[PDB]
Structures are given as structure tokens and as C-alpha cells.
Design an enzyme around this catalytic site. Structure first.
Site, PDB file in Angstrom:
ATOM      1  CG  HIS C 104      43.298  36.430  37.900  1.00 16.27           C
ATOM      2  ND1 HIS C 104      44.483  36.970  37.452  1.00 16.27           N
ATOM      3  CD2 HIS C 104      42.582  37.461  38.410  1.00 16.27           C
ATOM      4  CE1 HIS C 104      44.481  38.274  37.666  1.00 16.27           C
ATOM      5  NE2 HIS C 104      43.344  38.595  38.261  1.00 16.27           N
ATOM      6  CG  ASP C 106      39.079  40.208  38.679  1.00 10.50           C
ATOM      7  OD1 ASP C 106      40.279  39.909  38.907  1.00 10.50           O
ATOM      8  OD2 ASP C 106      38.718  41.180  37.994  1.00 10.50           O
ATOM      9  CG  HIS C 245      42.237  40.169  34.184  1.00 12.03           C
ATOM     10  ND1 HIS C 245      40.989  39.786  34.616  1.00 12.03           N
ATOM     11  CD2 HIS C 245      42.898  40.609  35.281  1.00 12.03           C
ATOM     12  CE1 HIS C 245      40.887  40.010  35.916  1.00 12.03           C
ATOM     13  NE2 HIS C 245      42.029  40.514  36.342  1.00 12.03           N
ATOM     14  NE  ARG C 260      39.027  44.462  41.052  1.00  7.92           N
ATOM     15  CZ  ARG C 260      39.315  43.218  41.430  1.00  7.92           C
ATOM     16  NH1 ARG C 260      40.138  42.474  40.697  1.00  7.92           N
ATOM     17  NH2 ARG C 260      38.799  42.721  42.549  1.00  7.92           N
TER      18      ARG C 260
HETATM   19 FE   LIG Z   1      42.342  40.389  38.323  1.00  5.28          FE
END
Ligand SMILES: [Fe+3]
Ligand SMILES: [Fe+3]
Ligand SMILES: [Fe+3]
Ligand SMILES: [Fe+3]
Lengths: 301, 304, 298, 297
Positions: C104, C106, C245, C260
Site C-alpha cells: 500500500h 499510506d 510498502h 510513525r
Molecule cells: Fe503503511
């Protein structure tokens, strides 16, 4: 067994001419009415089992009432549709063309066993109906693909993929989900038949990405031209098909012209796989649509 | 079972650390040589059976002669290749990157059981090798797809369908690779003769599926290959000089990545003789074209 | 789009080295401690390195905690909320547990797709658990003419409807994005797809799966990917306009936690400058829409 | 231009009845012979261009010679086949069923423009021929798929028992555009079918997927005309605008139809580029026709 079959036809005063190797036959010598004698009805029943789709011609005497009365001799008529109420309460009035390969109402537990269809309004060209034998498709599978489908299960739903919009709104007014085996055993003939078609949403225990590829592969085997019977409609025609052994497709090749056919469908039973296990309801109740038929094996099968 | 494994490792003076859930382990405490004692060879055999790919590091003493001598302790070395003659006489000298998912030499009856690989020349970046567990892929199949593959057979051939190697030299290689024609019908599911584990046998040498038309071949091949090469089933190793990899060619596929531009990459391979695959009913593969007896013997395997 | 002598001068002047780790993607940066008080020139050197290499990794960053990681990330852009819908897993950072094992980009289901993320491990399994990234720029470059002609005209609907999933889908987002976007800072064309894609505009469902699989396979081709084995102290930064990723779930039942910070992006534009269109949802609470600056090297 | 069309048919004394929205029409009022006047020949040509497949019925006067003489009025008859010589010398004698979707002889540069077909022997049931409009398929593509096929090229080959040996006695490979521009109507038409081996600049894995996708759009039922044969029927189809398929649904019964094909020209893509020969020479099979645009299109 073939000679016995011809004798049954003869005794019932009908002729049955094959129209294709795997599917389709023309019946002559009989006017479809609600007062047909039992032996003649059973001859039609047998012809249907063997040939999957029957066509009759010059039935100009038939109206909605007459078609309904005749259909009652072959089974217990369902409501026109589980969700669609605006196109008839006794017969289903199909308008336009049903252009997607499907078996009728596979999204309920009690998949209807058969339909009786006659044209009411026809375009100047096009608008044929074509049927595929799902029995022949199973027969033609090689061993590894048979091993696959014998174990495969599928969820069917009525939420499939101006007036056309309104129709879909009614069609999906209530939600049905039923998990059916991909191979069902015909309760009257014993023949194994593929159960798929456009109402299928997913396969049990398989990811979505693999669904499309396998669905496509299996549908292409079902709709292979050699397995199909395509009928050009004329007024006075009547078709009867085994909804346990076929899929069908109404072709939208008649432009903007009007096309109307009237359908009577007969109650069926719940499908069973090759181990005798029945389909499972996830969502919905179809008891208002039809009862569950208790089928009877044909002694020639 | 694991206590027995731990004792075998201990007696051989090695450590075996898992590098992935389904595949890959690093072995320490041993110098790969042609005179390794039997207990250490047994330990390596067991570690390989369990983990499918082993990597060893700082093996700076190894040359071609030493790698061959070590490899012969694990089985009987084949010729470098059944058809390729111009790229090594004792070892196969692989240049560039073998960037297509494959099991080694599946187009013969006697699929080699294992390979020993060491780098000779490496690019400044990129050029990893990645392996996939075909055992894990089989384990992860749902019932209907397992039923499919248990009955499925496929024809493998050497006539199959960059990395710093010229287009011209790749042409000459392919010409030699296909100088004689091999066709072998293998089961898509084989039973490992030493572990008893079932594994998928597919890869880029596959040309067709028995009793299925071409259109259905591409869709099903893609589907099964995607299950094999699913990232969770893969171990990807960044090479350094001194490294050695050993893999179970009965339980894996692999792929050399061409992500190093026009730089040079060279690794040397020794393959060990295997046996003829058997399906879950004990039926053997069938030869259609070709004879590989000049290339290798047929190993008599022993259950572990 | 290349590392020329100008690029090298910029790195030199900023006291960093940038080591390529793959032909199309991935670089290790040395000579710098990621902190919230880095000088502007060193930040711009990192921005350039990221544009060129799509994913950067830094090592031995043991001074970093959540607060420090946020403070540094702020130098590269405006931190978004942790997520448009997920609120129970962090207030400044997104606390990712397990592995995000589906390819995907993000948050592509909103109009303002975030431009980049900064990721650092907090807890790692004893084996496995790598993250791999694919270059969607390289994938576009490698298309032959007929497929490029296809994707230049192709549009796709992205949606968040792909306990966590319940919260994830607590509000419904649908956005129609071009399959080819033009990167606003580098000018490079990039494929915009990934697992949030539900359908292709003007194409039937049967053709969707076949074409989606085909294009994803070109994106995730091993040659276009950089796979990083995490160690404590590592930090990765990736260009979410130029990558997809995948977090690999190959570590059994062990714990894996990475923290993140994502930075606000802009609305994608197709090769004709047409912007994505919102069908459902409002992401104004998640972030504002960034005004990008084109890099004078691209 | 429907007034012009109705007038051309009427003036030539024929009626042309549509049998499907995108393909198929029945022509009445005419006996197919070698001495038809030029105006009646041109009316049939226009009807064919518009409707892609024409059927005529009760043509019981026709034999091989008569069918050949009529076909000569529409173009230059080719040899029966580029490689098959033992199954007719003037006409191609087709036995069994050609059950694979294809455009005729697409593996040469000079794809024949049209075929004239009549039954000689028919099974007691089954054995229909169905045609698909490759023009309608192009029309129905959405923009992104149109952008794809406009730039796509494919290699066609004849290497698709004794018959197969003769069919493949010499090797032909031709690279054709997947979209050709019809030289007489200007309509864009997909050029694919069973002789296609590969797509230019695309790997094998992507070939199967895209081929299947495009063929499914071509053979979509709405784009097809399916005809149940009777003795005395004659079909004419535009081989620049169709594919066809003979259905093997008649068991082991005998089925035989006789074909005359007419010489065509080399396909051109939407950018005016012609097909490229890789292997083979078809000059013995036919010449290259110089086509003429119909001023109705
Ligand atoms: Fe992701
Ligand atoms: Fe129906
Ligand atoms: Fe290999
Ligand atoms: Fe033909």
C-alpha cells in the site's frame, strides 16, 4: 434406456427433437394447458431432465392465466421474485434484457427448480435467450479441476455488481446471503452440476484476488459455445428450463426497442454437495417467496 | 524433538539461528571444509532440512576446490549443468542475476536435491538472493486448492521464456542452454523423501499443466506462484565476500535480483544429485524428452 | 533526477554521505543525528536525498524517543494526525503493532495523501519483521508504450473500507485518484495504486482484478524493492508520493512495534494537471493541504 | 445517411433486414450469380460494410462454380489457403467445425478482406456459425483501454493430425496492429483472434491476461450473430471487421461448408503504419488489393 425414452414420448403423443449435443430440444405435438393428463406432464418432465431446456411453438392460446395453470402441473409456483414486487404478483414481467450469465435466484436457500417463459412483446431483431448446461461443464472438467470444485463453496447475494436504477433499488431492498456448494447433486437426476453465475460474491476460504481468476475460469467453461443453446423468440413460443442444470443470459442486442417476456418459476429444494451437505443461510428469509420442495428421483436416472 | 535437535547442534559445536518464520537460518561455529567430521555434516543436514536455506559467514578460506570438496560431503555433485558447458567444469559460474523464480534444473527427472553457493564478485549495492519455501506455500493452501494441486501434473522444459551481462552474451548462453531439449512431467505436489513434508514443484521451467488448455495454464500458474513467493514465505540475503548459502532444492524456489545496474556479479554453484519426484500417491515423474544420466546419478534418499 | 556533482556538493556541504542500497530505491545516510534542531541546510540535503532515493535509512539513532522523532519530523513538513479515523493508537505518532502486510501507499483514500513518513522501531522480534518498499516511479519508467498510454488515462477509486478495522472504518472515505500522478516536487511520474483501490473508473469488476494484479506485479517486482532488516536505533524515511510498502509478518507471535510520524501532502494531479475528486469524506481534521515547492534540481 | 442507404437498397431491388444491433442482416430479393449487374453488386458491398455479416437464403441454384463466379464480383479470389492444398483448389472445403474464435488467415500480411460461405452437408442438429463484430468491440472500449489498444501490436502465426502438419508445413509470422483502420469504411476494428502468439514489448505473463480480456470484449454475446445453417443459405462476412467460430455441438455427424475468400490489403494502425512481416511469403496465396473508400462513410 434411449428406446424406453422414445416409447414414453410416443405414448404421450409428443415428439422431442434435439437442438444441440448437450442442451436444447424442441417439443411438438402438444398444446400447453392446465388440464394436460398426468402421463403427458411426466413425459415433458422427463424430456426436461434429459435436455435441460425445452421449447414449444405455436402456443398462441396461452395467456398469463393459462401459462400459470400449466406451470402448476410441473411444480408449486413461487412468488414472481423475493424482492421485486413492481412487475407482477403472479407472474414475473421481465423487461429489457437479462444480460449477465446466471442461474435464477441463487441467492436464497431454496433455489427455484425450473421456469416457464413465453414472450409478450418482441423487438424487430435480436433479443435471443441463450442457456448453458452446467451439467456438461462439470462432465468436461479434468480430474484436478473436479477435485477443486467438489470442495469449493460460494456465497451468493442479491447485491450483485433511470428505470434500471430504480429496479436495482427494489431488487436490493432486502439483503440475502447464502453459502452454496459449487458442485450440487441434482435431486431428480443425480447428475452433478456447477452452481455459480453472476450472484456469486466470493469463495469460502479463498482471498478476493483469487476469486476473480477462478470465477472467470469456471464461468468460461460453463459458457463455452458448444455447451449453449440460443433461441430466437417468436410470438407463440414457450421455453421451459431446468434451473438446477443451467445458466441463462438474455441478450441486449435489440437497441432501444421494447422487449417483454412473462415468467413462472417453480419452487425448488436446498442444494446439496457431493457429500450430501446442504447450503447455509447467512442473511435473509425466503419463506415468503416459496416453500422448500421435496424432490423425487426420476427412475430412469 | 527439539531437544534432540539442540543436542545434535551442540555435539557439532554449531549455533543455528532462525532468520525468518518459514525459511532461513544463520549457522556459526564451523569452517566449511572437505574434511568436516560426520557429526557436523549430520548437523548441517538437519539444520537444512528444518530451515530450508542456511547461510554461513567469514568463510574466506574457501576457493572452488574447497567448496566442491565440502559439497561432496552432503551428496554426489552433478556436472555444473545438463546443457551449459562454457561456464565452468567443476562449478557453475553464474554471472549477472538469475531474476526469475525457479527451482534449479526441474526440467530433468533427477531434480538436484540441494545447492551450495558462494560469491566471487559482488556489486557495491543490490544483488541479493531471495528464496521462497514451497513447503510453506503448500501448508498455507485452503482445502479446495490443495485438492487441486494434489492431482495436478506439469511439464517442465529447458526451453524457458541485464545484471551487467550484455544482450549478446545472454543470447549465446540461451543458445547453449537449449542445445538439447528436455521435457519432464512432474507432479505439482511432491513428497520430500527425507522429511516427508509436501512441497509445491513449479517455477519458471513449467510450460503447461497436464489435461488443462493454455488459457487456464497462465491463470493457475500465476495464482500458485503468487502463493509461493508471498513475502512472508521468503528469505532475502545481502551477499558479502566470505558468505556461503546452502539450500534444499526440494523445498524452495529462488531468485537473484537484478537491482545493481551494469555492475558485475558472479557466484559459483555446486549442485548435489537428487531423486525423481513422487506425488502424494507415490507415482514418479515421467520423462518425455531427454536423458540426464550424463549429468547426474539418481540418489537413494534416506528418511531423516 | 540523478546524483550529479551538484548533488554531491550539497551532501558534502551538509556533512552527510548518502550510500545507494539499490538501483531504483534505498540509501543509507551517515554523518547525521536526526534531531529537532538540525540546521536548514542539513534538512534540505535530507529532502534532496529522499527525493532521489525514495527511502532513506539512518542507524545508531539511539538518542531518539517519540518526542524527539516528532520534533525532527516537523522539520520536513506538517505532522498529520496519526490517522484520519484511528484515534486509539497514538495522539502525535501512529503506534503500529504487528505487521502491515498488504502492499500500500499510506492513506490514499483521502484527497490529501500524506507526502512522507518517519518510522523507528521500538520493539523488534528475534527474527523476521522486515519492511520492504517498492518504487512506483521506477515501475512507471519501466512500462512499455501501450501500458503507459493505458495508465496515463486511468483513474481509480480508493476507500478505507478494505476492533481496529471497526475504528479504521468508523467514517467512510472514497476518493477518485489518477493512477498516474505527477510528483509536485520532483516532477517524476509515479503509479498511484495499492490495496486501498476498490475499482477503476469506466471499467467493469472482472477487468478490475486482472488489471490491478498486472500493475501491482510491475510495482512490486523484486528489482524495484528495498527490504530492510530493522535494528534498534534505525530510522527510515520514505517518500509516500513515490513508493508503496509492506510490513512482513514472518516473525511468528513475537511482538513488533514501530512508531510513525506522517507529514501532510497535497492532492494528486494527473499528467494533464487535473486533481483527484472527493466522493465521500472530509479529511480537514487529519491535515491541511500542503503547498509543495518544486526542487530546482528536478 | 440512412435515407441514402434505404434508397441504394431499393434501387438495387434488395431488402436488408437487421438481425442484431451490431452485426448480422438478411438480404432478400436477389439470386447470387456471376452475372449480377454492377449496381446490385455495390448494394451488397454497402450492406456488408454496414452489417458485417450478410445471410442469403434459398440460393439452391448455387454450386461451387456459381459461388466462385459470384465471389469474383466482390474481389479477387485467393488460393483456398496459404498452406493447405489438399482440401480444394478453387474453394476451401471445410469439414467439421472451426471452434476457436478467429479472424481468417491473420498470420499473413495480406489478410483476406471477406469470405463467401455455403453449406454442402449439415448435421441433424447443432453446427451453427457465430460471428463477432470487432468494430463494435472497439466502439465499446472506455478511453483508457482505447489508449492501450491504439498503441498495441501483436505477432500472429500459423503455428497455433495430418491436416495440422499441412497447415504448418511452412512458417508465417506477421506483426499486426491490434487496432486497424478499415480501408473502405474508416471504422476502427480490433485485430486479434486465435492466431495471436504474443504482444510486442509485453512479457508472456501479461499476454494471457490482456488477450483474454480483449477477446472477452469481442465475443460478448451482444456483439455476436449466431446462424443456424440450412441448405441453400449463403453467408458473406467482412473479415476486416469480424471474428467467427464454428460450433462443435453436433457430436460425430458430418458437416461440410465451401468457402471462397477474397484478397485483402495490409492492415494499417491508427497512425498509418502497416504490418510487418517476420517470416513467410504470401504472394502465391493472393496479391495485395488496392482498396476503395465508400463515399457513404
Ligand atoms: Fe503503511
Ligand atoms: Fe434469469
Ligand atoms: Fe537457481
Ligand atoms: Fe475461419
Amino acid at each position: 434406456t434411449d428406446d424406453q425414452t422414445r416409447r414414453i414420448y410416443r405414448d404421450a403423443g409428443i415428439t422431442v427433437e434435439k437442438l444441440g449435443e448437450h442442451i436444447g430440444a424442441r417439443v411438438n405435438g402438444i398444446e400447453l394447458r392446465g388440464d394436460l393428463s398426468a402421463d403427458r406432464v411426466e413425459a415433458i418432465r422427463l424430456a426436461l431432465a434429459i435436455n435441460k431446456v425445452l421449447v414449444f411453438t405455436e402456443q398462441h392460446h396461452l395467456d398469463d392465466a393459462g401459462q400459470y395453470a400449466f406451470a402448476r402441473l410441473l411444480g408449486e409456483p413461487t412468488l414472481p421474485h423475493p424482492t421485486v414486487r413492481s412487475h407482477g404478483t403472479e407472474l414475473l414481467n421481465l423487461e429489457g434484457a437479462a444480460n449477465g450469465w446466471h442461474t435464477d435466484v441463487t441467492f436464497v436457500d431454496r433455489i427455484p427448480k425450473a421456469s416457464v417463459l413465453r414472450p409478450v412483446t418482441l423487438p424487430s431483431y435480436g433479443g435471443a435467450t441463450t442457456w448453458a448446461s452446467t451439467v456438461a461443464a462439470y462432465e468436461q472438467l479434468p480430474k484436478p479441476l473436479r477435485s477443486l470444485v467438489d470442495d469449493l463453496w460460494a456465497t451468493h447475494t442479491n447485491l450483485y455488481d433511470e428505470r434500471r436504477a430504480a429496479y436495482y433499488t427494489e431488487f436490493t431492498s432486502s439483503r440475502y446471503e447464502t453459502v452454496h456448494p459449487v458442485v450440487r447433486v441434482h435431486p431428480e437426476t443425480g447428475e452433478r452440476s456447477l452452481l455459480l453465475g453472476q450472484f456469486v460474491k466470493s469463495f469460502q476460504d479463498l482471498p478476493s484476488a483469487e476469486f476473480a481468476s477462478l470465477f472467470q475460469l469456471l464461468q468460461a467453461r460453463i459458457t463455452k459455445l458448444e455447451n449453449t443453446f440460443r433461441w430466437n423468440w417468436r410470438l407463440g413460443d414457450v421455453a421451459i428450463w431446468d434451473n438446477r442444470a443451467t445458466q441463462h443470459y438474455g441478450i441486449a442486442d435489440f437497441g432501444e426497442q421494447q422487449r417483454e417476456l412473462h415468467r413462472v418459476t417453480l419452487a425448488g429444494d436446498v442444494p446439496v454437495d457431493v457429500h450430501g451437505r446442504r447450503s447455509q443461510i447467512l442473511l435473509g428469509d425466503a419463506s415468503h417467496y416459496s416453500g422448500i420442495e421435496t424432490p423425487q428421483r426420476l427412475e430412469l436416472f
